[PDB]
């Protein structure tokens, strides 16, 4: 009875579609990472170049993608983006299949001309897939979620938290499953599994999106050389000036600045851990702890929003993250690299930074969701994504400039500083919304 109603409701179908999409995306990302680390060796330069390419492409095309999402029907945009992403992933999987089958041959076919051709083709396909994924995220997590929630902020916060939990769980699980598949068999079987899973997921998510559109009737109403390139530049300029003129500019600015960091767990931090003499089991349990603290951050954000308010929740999350970051700053000056105390303190700071950062991210995304007109949602969200990946591009450039372990600690400090800047900027926004009642939570008395 009730179980069937819950499994038939729009929220569950949306959750299922998002879970399938993120599982497939994470599997494909791990496959590409394995290809890069094995065929070309453990080179940070190539990974940084790939990140540079994807970040720059999104930076340039974000306004265009947002405008396209804004000026078209909701069902068509989502279906087209999903089809494009899944087709791109399938083609990349087939190409990786053919590359992996001829391992020794391609390693000795020529000086590397065919190898570089395969690299650039994979990079282009991955760039297209990332653009499609960004379009899907903009059209689903910013447009459809609000319409499904309606006039209920608690429901919107719960959906955002559940999406974040699904993302964290798939991030911690799917790489392990696909790695076990690869290690029990061969990478070719892994790529085949990627391709088949993405095709079946394409079909299932198409059907699920149709069902979601049918179940919510409020999604059908929407309120609104040089000559060829004249209009995209106008769209870019208009989107950026509109984003700059928005009153929630500071919050998105700080969220973008928060991406300028090396204190994650999918970055060269794992390389530093390996260079400090830590086994893989320690890394696995640390990743599990990071996922657990992400879930804790989501639930803490929900409770803090319910009890205190959005802006004060953001302030509390920022203060927590800053405390974690100063713990890391204390860590870097301890004895160690320019013996276990330094790495232990750094990792604890990283995990607690993860929980604080997830709380802050949820606060900022809700603020952007509920304070933007529905006729400019896509363009503002696209410009926000563009700034986030601009900061990611800067991070990749910095990692390229200082690859040696010895300077890594210095890099850490820079990251910390930028985080502080972001929160400081958010603080100003808080003032512009709260004035002198900043440190007062609860009903007035």
């Amino acid at each position, epitope marked *: 009875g009730s179980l069937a109603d819950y499994l038939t409701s729009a929220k569950f179908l949306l959750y299922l579609g998002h879970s399938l999409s993120t599982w497939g995306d994470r599997m494909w990302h791990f496959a590409v990472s394995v290809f890069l680390v094995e065929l070309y060796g453990n080179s940070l330069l190539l990974t940084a170049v790939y990140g540079l390419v994807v970040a720059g492409s999104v930076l340039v095309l974000g306004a265009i993608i947002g405008d396209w999402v804004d000026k078209n029907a909701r069902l068509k945009v989502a279906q087209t983006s999903l089809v494009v992403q899944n087709v791109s992933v399938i083609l990349c999987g087939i190409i990786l299949m053919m590359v992996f089958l001829h391992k020794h041959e391609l390693l000795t076919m020529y000086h590397g001309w065919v190898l570089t051709s395969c690299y650039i083709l994979i990079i282009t396909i991955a760039n297209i897939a990332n653009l499609a994924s960004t379009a899907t995220a903009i059209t689903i997590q910013r447009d459809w979620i609000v319409v499904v929630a309606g006039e*209920d902020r608690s429901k919107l916060a719960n959906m955002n938290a559940t999406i974040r939990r699904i993302d964290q769980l798939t991030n911690i699980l799917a790489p392990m499953a696909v790695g076990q598949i690869m290690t029990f068999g061969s990478p070719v079987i892994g790529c085949g599994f990627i391709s088949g899973w993405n095709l079946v997921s394409m079909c299932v998510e198409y059907v699920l999106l149709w069902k979601v559109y049918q179940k919510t009737p409020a999604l059908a109403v929407k309120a609104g050389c040089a000559s060829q390139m004249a209009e995209p530049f106008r769209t870019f300029r208009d989107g950026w000036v509109s984003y700059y003129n928005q*009153p929630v500019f500071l919050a998105g600015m700080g969220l973008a600045f928060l991406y300028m960091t090396v204190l994650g767990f999918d970055c060269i931090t794992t390389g530093y851990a390996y260079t400090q003499g830590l086994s893989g089991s320690i890394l696995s349990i640390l990743m599990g702890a990071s996922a657990i603290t992400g879930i804790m951050g989501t639930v803490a954000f929900t409770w803090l929003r*319910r009890k205190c308010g959005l802006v004060r929740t953001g302030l509390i999350s920022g203060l927590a993250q800053l405390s974690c970051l100063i713990l890391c700053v204390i860590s870097v000056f301890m004895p160690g690299s320019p013996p276990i105390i330094s790495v232990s303190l750094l990792f604890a700071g990283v995990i607690a930074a993860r929980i604080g950062l997830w709380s802050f991210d949820l606060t900022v995304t809700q603020l952007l969701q509920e304070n933007v007109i529905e006729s400019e949602r896509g363009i503002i969200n696209g410009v926000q994504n563009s700034m986030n990946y601009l900061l990611d591009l800067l991070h990749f450039i910095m990692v390229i400039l200082a690859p040696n372990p010895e300077a890594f600690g210095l890099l850490v400090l820079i990251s910390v500083s930028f985080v502080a800047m972001g929160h400081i900027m958010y603080f100003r926004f808080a003032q512009n919304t709260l004035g002198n009642k900043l440190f007062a939570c609860g*009903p007035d008395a």
Partner: antibody
Amino acid sequence: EVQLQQSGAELVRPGALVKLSCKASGFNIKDYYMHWVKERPEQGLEWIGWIDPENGNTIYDPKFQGKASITADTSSNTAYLQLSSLTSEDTAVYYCARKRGYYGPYFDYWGQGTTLTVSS
Amino acid sequence: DIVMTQSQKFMSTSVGDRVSITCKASQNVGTAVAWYQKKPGQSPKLLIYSASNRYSGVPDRFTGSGSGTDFTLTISNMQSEDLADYFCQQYGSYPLTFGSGTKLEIKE
């Protein structure tokens, strides 16, 4: 049909306590921000403050800080404005307004307005 | 704070002529200006939001324009039902401030 009804025809002596109500029909005050606006006769429109009925966070304008107090009741779906230390300058017309978010584009629905006159 | 100044307080007009009402900001509010129209003895209504977007139900003769510091509301063809008081409100920053208002009266 979203509607907001208010009390009316308030006559009060200087230096007393005044309570205005704002009952909402067709929606829930919990999902919106409830604002209060004052209009002095032959004058402009002034902003008093806003309240969030979900949690009780109330923010006021600097001028109407120690004089006004905004409360809300979700069960009865009604906002309340409390005015204290009344003076002859406070005779005006008060409106109850609805806002979507912190920086919502507009006040879509307004109340009928309550006329407050203080006299001797 | 942000002070909104409307220059003219009484604009004399005739039926069937374009009417322009100006609104000036003390700082750069961006595109956050909403125009409200109110007849005498009734609650204020909604005409334009975000300085360019017209609300659902407003006649097409109302057009908003401007950005940054200067904003203007234009009526293409004045009718007898458009004689009221119009004011501009910003929402870029708190506390919210309203305009002084402009009253439209016919010519004779």
